[PDB]
Amino acid sequence: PNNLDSNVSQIVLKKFLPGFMSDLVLAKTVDRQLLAGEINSSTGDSVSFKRPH
């Protein structure tokens, strides 16, 4: 009956396991050009575009 357990360490290696993930689809198919850079500090919180006649 040896007892050697105090000769050694409990080691946690420095690496992580793969987590889960999700995919981004809606984000990349809507219109992103029209509204870009259009709202700045001269404009207040909103801006408008024209409906066709």
Partner: protein
Amino acid sequence: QFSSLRTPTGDISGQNKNNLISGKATGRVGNYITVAVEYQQLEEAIKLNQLEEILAPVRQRIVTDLETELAHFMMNNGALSLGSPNTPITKWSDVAQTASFLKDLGVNEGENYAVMDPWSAQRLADAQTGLHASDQLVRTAWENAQIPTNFGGIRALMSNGLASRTQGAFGGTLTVKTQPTVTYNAVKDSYQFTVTLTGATASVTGFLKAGDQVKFTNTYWLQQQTKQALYNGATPISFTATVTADANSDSGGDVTVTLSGVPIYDTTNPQYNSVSRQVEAGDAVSVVGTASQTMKPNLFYNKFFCGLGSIPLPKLHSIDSAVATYEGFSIRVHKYADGDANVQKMRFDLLPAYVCFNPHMGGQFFGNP
């Protein structure tokens, strides 16, 4: 994993920031695998020729008994479940459901595998002889009874060495007796939990056996990143866990079992939830399959689910030895003898090691009724 607040201004004053809660997975060393032989000095003289051929199969015994224990190890941990053992694999949509379930939960890294026995691979081979279009693809299965490398958008494999399991005798209608403590603090180092069950049959040895699968009817899997429940067509996908060891039903019909996979639902750290709600005392549950059935399960898993390793063995002193690898595993052999009984002894050894990184990345699958 984290969570976020959504506010008109951005004023977070009266609210709760994310805590940091570490968790870990742990590997362990297993039993040795040993094959030992002996014979008298008299036999070495008159009766043993081609002794070197007499012990060729000895090293493949070692590696065979590694693969058989590995298969049990997996079958006992992975929580996921598809189909049910009463229906054998037939349709294309059987092998296919497994790859799209791994993607709906969000497994993104490495490669996914499905593994089945020869009888299953044959019923998928004559499903492929029925296709109405692809000229080569039917000819191959008609000739050779083979199926492609990728099947259903997962990578499919056949293996004749694969373990079986017996269900164990369960009956009556089951419900949970008390609330389990499932928060991320309790389960974060294991991913296992104990729960007591009610309404079982009076006194039964082996009421549930290691490898069975208990299903919680009203508690649903989430998607792990997005946190929205999972729907397959009309109906939600229930949570399911695996019985890790044998469990007996005491008189009065109670059963206390340890399961692998956890229905985490945490109020304080909701960012870690697995599932749509808190399992409460009095919830219906049921065991997948028929009472005493036996069978060989099919396994589907992500690459990082289980892992395997082996440990160099040092040399005993005053004894002679050598190392030889077969299938990329190193195996010691010690050759020693007993001077008084006048016999000769050889032993061949290997040490394995096993991790289960995540229980929620693998499981067992059957067909759909």
